[PDB]
Amino acid sequence: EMVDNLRGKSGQGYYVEMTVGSPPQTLNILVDTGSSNFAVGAAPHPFLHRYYQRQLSSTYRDLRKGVYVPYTQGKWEGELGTDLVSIPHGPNVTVRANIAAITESDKFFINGSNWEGILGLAYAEIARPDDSLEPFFDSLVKQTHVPNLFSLQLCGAVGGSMIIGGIDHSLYTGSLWYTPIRREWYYEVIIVRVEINGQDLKMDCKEYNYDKSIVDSGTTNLRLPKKVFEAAVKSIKAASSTEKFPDGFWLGEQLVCWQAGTTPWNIFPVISLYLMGEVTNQSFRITILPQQYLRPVEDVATSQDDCYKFAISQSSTGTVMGAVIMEGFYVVFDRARKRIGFAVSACHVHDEFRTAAVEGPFVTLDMEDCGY
Ligand SMILES: COc1ccc([C@@]2(c3cccc(-c4cccnc4)c3)C[C@@H](OC)C(N)=N2)cc1
């Protein structure tokens, strides 16, 4: 009953239906492994189809604590409380959880995204206003018998599955390979090697994780530290040199379009991210095809052709393996065993020549520790 419980628009996140309060109020909620608050629209906003009405819920309790979150791309503010929360196409339970009722915001809600709040699935360390505010998943596990694990299968064109409490074997093929969760704050991981069409970027591996690397379903792009980003764009450019693209394309701002069905996938290279394995100096790789890192835009006005944005961008806050990386993998957030599994998803990307893959093991004898 949990399969196919996600929806989404390209570049706008994936969301799950939830209810809040009594009687239940239905909301679509963005599934966000890069944050740790359950935060929902709770006042009118031009971009909100609907919002949480606390006065209509007889089970609401105000915690009499406010919360204000300025972040890079926007800001939001509201009031903390608790109320009854359920996931209709998730586990068959209702729990009491913290809820941040969003009363003011700037560039937080997205016009036409079809979601009205965010379900932060990461750990208390990064909850706002501080780490004493217990995140949703922690309340779910505490109050029920649900195992301390969830998995995400995000699919491109959008839709997918969030399975809570276990692994659905129908959602992947081949082996599940695990990388340690380095620290329970973000879902922090370690990248030990990067190749672009099999060619090693040859950087000290600490560079790949300056200053952290995270798995974040609430960021669209693959985001890379400046030095890594510059190196990767240079290699992608060298491989795709039979065609030259506007400057703005590489800055992730500008569309490139081809006539229907003629996208030259074969001129774009595959990116290999090798992730730390569960045993010393062993790793596995996930391979990323241009079908993932050239994100298709779905706008009626541009629909005659196939148009894309370059979904790799420069970061000053570390590597972010965002939704375009997660797409086509089945990703297991095995909180109980402090690890994240990757497998090829049933909706994995492929063409006649190449397929997204998860492969291992690889051993590297002369390895420093790759973490910051
Ligand atoms: C608790 O405060 C926040 C602040 C920002 C976020 C976002 C967030 C906020 C609003 C919208 C999105 C979003 C937008 C487009 C596509 N996907 C997600 C993300 C930012 C992003 O990390 C940089 C992330 N993982 N979640 C979540 C909770």
Curated annotation (Swiss-Prot):
Glycosylated residues, chain numbering: 92, 111, 281
Induction: Up-regulated by the Ca(2+)-regulated transcription factor NFATC4.
Domain (Peptidase A1) ranges: 14-343
One cellular component (GO) term of this entry: late endosome
Protein modification: N-Glycosylated. Addition of a bisecting N-acetylglucosamine by MGAT3 blocks lysosomal targeting, further degradation and is required for maintaining stability under stress conditions.
Regulation of activity: Inhibited by RTN3 and RTN4.
Catalytic residue positions: 32, 216
Swiss-Prot/TrEMBL catalytic activity: Broad endopeptidase specificity. Cleaves Glu-Val-Asn-Leu-|-Asp-Ala-Glu-Phe in the Swedish variant of Alzheimer's amyloid precursor protein
Superkingdom per UniProt: Eukaryota
MF annotations from Gene Ontology: amyloid-beta binding; aspartic-type endopeptidase activity; beta-aspartyl-peptidase activity; endopeptidase activity; enzyme binding; peptidase activity; protein serine/threonine kinase binding
Residues that bear N6-acetyllysine: 65, 202, 206, 212, 226-227, 234
Major enzyme class: hydrolase
Disulphides: 155-347, 205-370, 257-307
GO biological process assignments: amyloid fibril formation; amyloid precursor protein catabolic process; amyloid-beta formation; amyloid-beta metabolic process; cellular response to amyloid-beta; cellular response to copper ion; cellular response to manganese ion; detection of mechanical stimulus involved in sensory perception of pain
Chief place where the protein resides: membrane
Function description: Responsible for the proteolytic processing of the amyloid precursor protein (APP). Cleaves at the N-terminus of the A-beta peptide sequence, between residues 671 and 672 of APP, leads to the generation and extracellular release of beta-cleaved soluble APP, and a corresponding cell-associated C-terminal fragment which is later released by gamma-secretase. Cleaves CHL1.
Domain notes: DXXLL motif is required for a proper endocytosis and retrograde transport to the trans-Golgi network, as well as for regulation of lysosomal degradation.
Name this protein carries in UniProt: Beta-secretase 1
Covered range of the whole protein: 62 to 445 of 501
